[PDB]
């Protein structure tokens, strides 16, 4: 159980790539909530057990709830990650 | 004094940095555009940007180091000649002779005015008036730059100006006196 921090680093990378490439706008937002959980894992891991529950309370329980609440009753168009659109980038 | 330049390797280094800057700017024009654009339109619809960067880099640093090695001193004239070469390279994309000459002379004049002020965007520290001896000399010494005296030595006047026009090593009065 040595490589825990490395594992959270890698899983955070993968979760951001799933954030920026997602079908549906709220599939992307649930990946952001997962990234908050990976953050709180890292914060307990480093020794800050207080902050992890502060992150789960404030960021997940208020900011993500406000964000999902916005996506529900508003209309947002989305193109998906075409390869024609984004390998010029 | 001065020591001779590496025209070879400074020109190689300049070609490297111009190639990289052309890569970065072609990627930037690719990303900031409209239309059907893919990964290898970066070098077809670039607008000839890597040619600009590398040609200017090779031309300026080759002409600068060559002129400083041919003149064997370093001043702003080398920036004048190197800016003339850069203006030649930037004016050849204009396939027109008078505009080519205009690019040459005006870019060379702008780069020579640049290189005459010190060839620095920022300041020089000890050359500043803030960090130099200023005001009057408090007693008689070699008057530096930024310093003021009341009287100058006449030997300095004869050596700096000349012995010609109205200027002499002894005044006209005491050169013509009765004994
Ligand atoms: C007193 C004030 C003195 C100031 C005078 C300067 C103004 C001259 C105007 C020249 C002119 O007409 O240009 C029009 C021309 C307008 O273009 P146009 O619509 O295609 O055609 C105009 C005429 O119809 C085209 O008619 P033409 O082809 O028959 O005219 C011939 C030629 C004639 O121009 C002349 O003046 C020739 C004079 C030679 C006589 C020498 C006698 C010396 C005594 O003019 C040109 O066409 C192009 C001149 C090149 C412009 C160079 C601009 C960059 C120079 C750096 C400025 C800073 O200007 C440009 O396109 C220049 C590009 C726009 C600016 C880009 C700036 C790029 C910066 C490059 C780097 C600069 C380095 C700075 C150093 C920094 C160090 C880190
Ligand atoms: C080394 C220098 C070489 C000197 C060469 C002369 C030079 C540069 C002048 C720069 C002056 C520098 C001054 C010092 C610094 C100040 C910056 C201008 O050449 C001009 O020469 C004139 C006189 O000979 C001609 O006028 C004549 O007037 C009547 C008869 O008097 C006639 O009836 C009338 O038909 C003429 O119009 C002009 O047509 C010609 O443009 C370059 O000439 C060369 O390049 C280009 C233009 O880059 C010239 O024209 C281009 O091609 C045309 C098809 O040819 C196309 O139409 C067009 O693509 C463009 O026009 C070329 O021709 C060629 O010659
Ligand atoms: C439309 C009109 C445009 C007018 C532009 C004129 C700009 C001309 C600038 C002249 C000036 C600033 C004075 C400006 C004052 C007010 C200016 C007003 C506003 C102007 C905007 C910048 O002098 C620059 O001149 C350049 C060439 O001329 C040099 O280029 C470079 O060269 C090679 C480097 O080694 C590079 O290798 C090459 O890469 C570069 O190219 C620069 O290094 C130099 O700093 C001179 O300042 C300097 O002069 C010297 C020598 O007296 C003073 O010396 C000291 O003092 C004496 C005892 O203490 C001794 O005698 C002296 O030995 C001692 O060292 C300094 O105190 C200092 O103050
Ligand atoms: C060893 C290491 C090697 C490193 C390689 C060297 C890298 C150097 C940096 C390269 C800078 C590239 C500039 C650039 O990004 O291209 C310009 C960009 C695209 O412009 P474009 O789409 O063509 O606009 C059309 C206009 N008709 O247009 C832009 O919008 C870019 C905005 C400006 C970019 C910053 C400029 C910084 C320099 C300031 C200018 C300096 C002025 C000095 C006087
Ligand atoms: C920002 C926009 C800028 C736009 C620029 C437009 C063009 C500006 C006008 C052109 C200015 C060109 C200035 C070139 C000066 C080059 C230079 O560094 O001159 C240095 C020279 C002293 O050099 P020195 O080492 O003492 O003697 C060498 C003899 N071979 O010093 C001298 O000999 C004096 C030279 C006087 C030149 C006067 C030019 C008119 C002012």
Swiss-Prot record, chain A:
Q: Name one GO molecular function term.
A: NADH dehydrogenase (ubiquinone) activity
Q: Where in the cell is it found?
A: Mitochondrion membrane
Query: What are the alphabetically sorted keywords of the record?
Result: Electron transport, Membrane, Mitochondrion, NAD, Respiratory chain, Translocase, Transmembrane, Transmembrane helix, Transport, Ubiquinone
The residue range of the signal peptide is none
Q: Does the keyword Glycoprotein apply?
A: no
Say which domain of life the source belongs to: Eukaryota
Record keywords: NAD included?
yes
Primary location recorded for the protein, binned into one broad class: mitochondrion
Q: Listed disulfide bonds for this chain?
A: none
Q: Which residues cross the membrane?
A: 1-20, 29-49, 50-70
Could you name the Gene Ontology cellular component terms for this entry? mitochondrial membrane
| Function (record text) | Core subunit of the mitochondrial membrane respiratory chain NADH dehydrogenase (Complex I) that is believed to belong to the minimal assembly required for catalysis. Complex I functions in the transfer of electrons from NADH to the respiratory chain. The immediate electron acceptor for the enzyme is believed to be ubiquinone.
Query: What family is this protein classified in?
Result: Belongs to the complex I subunit 6 family.
Question: What does the record note on quaternary structure?
Answer: Complex I is composed of 37 different subunits.
Q: Return the protein name.
A: NADH-ubiquinone oxidoreductase chain 6
The residues of the intact protein that this chain contains are 5 to 93 of 185
